[PDB]
Design an enzyme around this catalytic site. Structure first.
Site, PDB file in Angstrom:
ATOM      1  N   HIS A  86     -58.176  -5.194  50.217  1.00 52.59           N
ATOM      2  CA  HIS A  86     -57.362  -3.988  50.286  1.00 52.59           C
ATOM      3  C   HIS A  86     -56.102  -4.069  49.424  1.00 52.59           C
ATOM      4  O   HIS A  86     -55.247  -3.193  49.489  1.00 52.59           O
ATOM      5  CB  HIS A  86     -57.000  -3.650  51.738  1.00 52.59           C
ATOM      6  CG  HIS A  86     -55.853  -4.443  52.290  1.00 52.59           C
ATOM      7  ND1 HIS A  86     -56.031  -5.588  53.037  1.00 52.59           N
ATOM      8  CD2 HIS A  86     -54.518  -4.224  52.258  1.00 52.59           C
ATOM      9  CE1 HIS A  86     -54.859  -6.033  53.449  1.00 52.59           C
ATOM     10  NE2 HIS A  86     -53.923  -5.221  52.990  1.00 52.59           N
TER      11      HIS A  86
ATOM     12  N   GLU B 141     -43.383 -19.131  42.505  1.00 56.33           N
ATOM     13  CA  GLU B 141     -42.268 -18.304  42.909  1.00 56.33           C
ATOM     14  C   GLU B 141     -41.627 -18.710  44.206  1.00 56.33           C
ATOM     15  O   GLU B 141     -42.256 -19.332  45.059  1.00 56.33           O
ATOM     16  CB  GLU B 141     -42.723 -16.847  43.063  1.00 56.33           C
ATOM     17  CG  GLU B 141     -43.180 -16.173  41.795  1.00 56.33           C
ATOM     18  CD  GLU B 141     -42.039 -15.576  41.003  1.00 56.33           C
ATOM     19  OE1 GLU B 141     -40.875 -15.643  41.459  1.00 56.33           O
ATOM     20  OE2 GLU B 141     -42.319 -15.029  39.920  1.00 56.33           O
TER      21      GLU B 141
ATOM     22  N   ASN C  87     -37.859 -17.068  44.641  1.00 58.51           N
ATOM     23  CA  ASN C  87     -37.136 -15.802  44.535  1.00 58.51           C
ATOM     24  C   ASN C  87     -37.921 -14.914  43.566  1.00 58.51           C
ATOM     25  O   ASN C  87     -38.019 -15.216  42.362  1.00 58.51           O
ATOM     26  CB  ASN C  87     -35.709 -15.996  44.018  1.00 58.51           C
ATOM     27  CG  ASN C  87     -34.889 -14.714  44.096  1.00 58.51           C
ATOM     28  OD1 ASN C  87     -35.414 -13.611  43.895  1.00 58.51           O
ATOM     29  ND2 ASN C  87     -33.607 -14.848  44.398  1.00 58.51           N
TER      30      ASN C  87
ATOM     31  N   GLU D  22     -41.912 -20.676  37.349  1.00 55.99           N
ATOM     32  CA  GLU D  22     -42.821 -19.535  37.410  1.00 55.99           C
ATOM     33  C   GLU D  22     -43.848 -19.574  36.300  1.00 55.99           C
ATOM     34  O   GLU D  22     -43.628 -20.146  35.233  1.00 55.99           O
ATOM     35  CB  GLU D  22     -42.071 -18.208  37.304  1.00 55.99           C
ATOM     36  CG  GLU D  22     -41.202 -17.891  38.492  1.00 55.99           C
ATOM     37  CD  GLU D  22     -39.742 -18.058  38.186  1.00 55.99           C
ATOM     38  OE1 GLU D  22     -39.408 -18.733  37.183  1.00 55.99           O
ATOM     39  OE2 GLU D  22     -38.925 -17.496  38.941  1.00 55.99           O
TER      40      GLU D  22
ATOM     41  N   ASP E 195     -62.649  -8.088  54.311  1.00 58.25           N
ATOM     42  CA  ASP E 195     -61.404  -7.923  53.572  1.00 58.25           C
ATOM     43  C   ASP E 195     -61.056  -9.199  52.823  1.00 58.25           C
ATOM     44  O   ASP E 195     -60.198  -9.974  53.236  1.00 58.25           O
ATOM     45  CB  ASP E 195     -60.270  -7.537  54.524  1.00 58.25           C
ATOM     46  CG  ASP E 195     -59.053  -6.986  53.798  1.00 58.25           C
ATOM     47  OD1 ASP E 195     -59.111  -6.827  52.564  1.00 58.25           O
ATOM     48  OD2 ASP E 195     -58.036  -6.708  54.460  1.00 58.25           O
TER      49      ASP E 195
ATOM     50  N   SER F 165     -46.927 -11.534  60.617  1.00 58.81           N
ATOM     51  CA  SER F 165     -46.973 -11.237  59.199  1.00 58.81           C
ATOM     52  C   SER F 165     -46.749  -9.720  59.183  1.00 58.81           C
ATOM     53  O   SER F 165     -46.859  -9.061  60.224  1.00 58.81           O
ATOM     54  CB  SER F 165     -48.335 -11.596  58.615  1.00 58.81           C
ATOM     55  OG  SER F 165     -49.368 -10.908  59.294  1.00 58.81           O
TER      56      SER F 165
ATOM     57  N   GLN G  21     -46.172  -5.940  56.291  1.00 58.87           N
ATOM     58  CA  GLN G  21     -46.450  -5.374  54.970  1.00 58.87           C
ATOM     59  C   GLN G  21     -45.862  -6.175  53.820  1.00 58.87           C
ATOM     60  O   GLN G  21     -44.685  -6.512  53.819  1.00 58.87           O
ATOM     61  CB  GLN G  21     -46.019  -3.912  54.882  1.00 58.87           C
ATOM     62  CG  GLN G  21     -47.003  -2.969  55.536  1.00 58.87           C
ATOM     63  CD  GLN G  21     -47.057  -3.136  57.038  1.00 58.87           C
ATOM     64  OE1 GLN G  21     -46.022  -3.226  57.699  1.00 58.87           O
ATOM     65  NE2 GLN G  21     -48.262  -3.173  57.588  1.00 58.87           N
TER      66      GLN G  21
ATOM     67  N   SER H 216     -50.005  -9.119  53.082  1.00 56.85           N
ATOM     68  CA  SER H 216     -51.452  -9.020  52.905  1.00 56.85           C
ATOM     69  C   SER H 216     -51.925  -9.890  51.759  1.00 56.85           C
ATOM     70  O   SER H 216     -51.206 -10.077  50.787  1.00 56.85           O
ATOM     71  CB  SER H 216     -51.872  -7.577  52.652  1.00 56.85           C
ATOM     72  OG  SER H 216     -52.088  -6.888  53.873  1.00 56.85           O
TER      73      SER H 216
HETATM   74 CA    CA Z   1     -38.619 -15.905  40.505  1.00 51.63          CA
END
Ligand code: CA
Lengths: 223, 22
Positions: A40, A52, A54, A62, A84, A172, A174, A177
């Site tokens: 989804h 990551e 921040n 990163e 899902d 958990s 929004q 997911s």
């Molecule tokens: Ca970052």
């Protein structure tokens, strides 16, 4: 994550952020060129951001890699959210190191009571929307199928499992997911759905990855 | 009126509340 804590920069090396000009979903790296997330969460032009902490600032470590293809489970159903699960092939292999590492696919399913670590940049507030810049972590146990199906009568399939707390306050939410539910160093779940966030008697519902270990292996093997 | 009874929602940005009211 509601009720969790700050993971600490790069302490969850398999967590990836699905970005499309903003963080929309989470994922977990299972190997140098493949990511597991929720079906989804699918959309075009997905950029996978690895290493990551921040998500708003670039602070070293990163790796921005674009999705070369998102293989949603053929039997995914948008209404029930059964099946899902989605695989995302990376355009180029990520450089694995102490800060960016894959997580192991389980060999067997976990038992009720198993303590797991759920992480993500999802909403940190149940009533409202407050998003964190850094990755949040939460320790939550896999619930017993009876308590799960009793909370969500008829909505729980064999490919779903509840994890969390019935009293609420830790869950958990929004943005989480597609994120990982890791138990004893094995990816046991994918953050999927739930009735709200951290609500009493409404645990988080997760994708039971052990049921997909063979699908994942074969799919990846043929792509 | 409101999102049915217990709107089963996905935890995505943004979410998908297909609800639970069957
Ligand atoms: Ca970052």
């Amino acid at each position: 994550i509601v009720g969790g804590y700050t993971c600490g920069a790069n302490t969850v090396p398999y967590q990836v952020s699905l970005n499309s000009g903003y963080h929309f979903c989470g994922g977990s790296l299972i190997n140098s060129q493949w990511v597991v997330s929720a079906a989804h969460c699918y959309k075009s032009g997905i950029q996978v951001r690895l290493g990551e902490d921040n998500i708003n600032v670039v602070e070293g470590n990163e790796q921005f890699i674009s999705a070369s293809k998102s293989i949603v489970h053929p039997s995914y159903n948008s209404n029930t959210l059964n099946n899902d699960i989605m695989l995302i092939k990376l355009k180029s292999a990520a450089s694995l190191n102490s800060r960016v590492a894959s997580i192991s696919l389980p060999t067997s399913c976990a038992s009720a009571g198993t303590q797991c670590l759920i992480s993500g940049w999802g909403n940190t507030k149940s009533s409202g929307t407050s998003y964190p810049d850094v990755l949040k972590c939460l320790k939550a146990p896999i619930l017993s199928d009876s308590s799960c199906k009793s909370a969500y009568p008829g909505q729980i399939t064999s490919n779903m499992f509840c994890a969390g707390y019935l009293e609420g306050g830790k869950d958990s939410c929004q943005g989480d997911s597609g994120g990982p539910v890791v138990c004893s160093g094995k990816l046991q779940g994918i953050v999927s759905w739930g009735s709200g966030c951290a609500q009493k008697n409404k645990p988080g519902v997760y994708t039971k990855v052990c049921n997909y270990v063979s699908w994942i292996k074969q799919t990846i093997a043929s792509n | 009126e409101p999102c049915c009874d217990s709107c089963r929602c996905t935890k995505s940005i943004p979410p998908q509340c297909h609800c639970a009211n069957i």
